Amino acid sequence: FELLHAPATVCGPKKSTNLVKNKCVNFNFNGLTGTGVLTESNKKFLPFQQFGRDIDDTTDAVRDPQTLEILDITPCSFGGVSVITPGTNTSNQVAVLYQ
Amino acid sequence: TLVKQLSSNFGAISSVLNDILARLDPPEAEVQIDRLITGRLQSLQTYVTQ
């Protein structure tokens, strides 16, 4: 095995598993490693383009390297967590708002 | 502009933190991610002030 300075062309195998959508996961689409929900998507790609970016170059839709199916993406949900309350001097009850 | 600032190295090895994670985990990871944090922190602060 000689590893010449040029990039190595013959490599080991790629152990690829199944893809599940409508519930966010970490994902590994050949470099694309974000964290979000994948879903079916409609917008059409050209025969060779490989990502989908948008207004500020955020990875925004990707096609599976195995099957020609465009998938849309959205980062996992998240938001503030706050508490409304009557004063401690009038009660102790508490209602919580997820933002 | 703020979001665009995430696509810059600020003098580190890359513009993603995951790649530096992959390449080098021991101290040099600190002496690199230092710069990512410093730069991104400025960008946020200089958004807040104006």
Partner: peptide
């Protein structure tokens, strides 16, 4: 159903983001 007034509708029709943000 939205009781915007008429000239207010003209005004409205005239005038014309999730990497860690949110708009309340």
């Amino acid at each position: 159903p939205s009781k915007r007034s008429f000239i207010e509708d003209l005004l409205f029709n005239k005038v014309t983001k999730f990497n860690g943000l949110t708009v309340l």
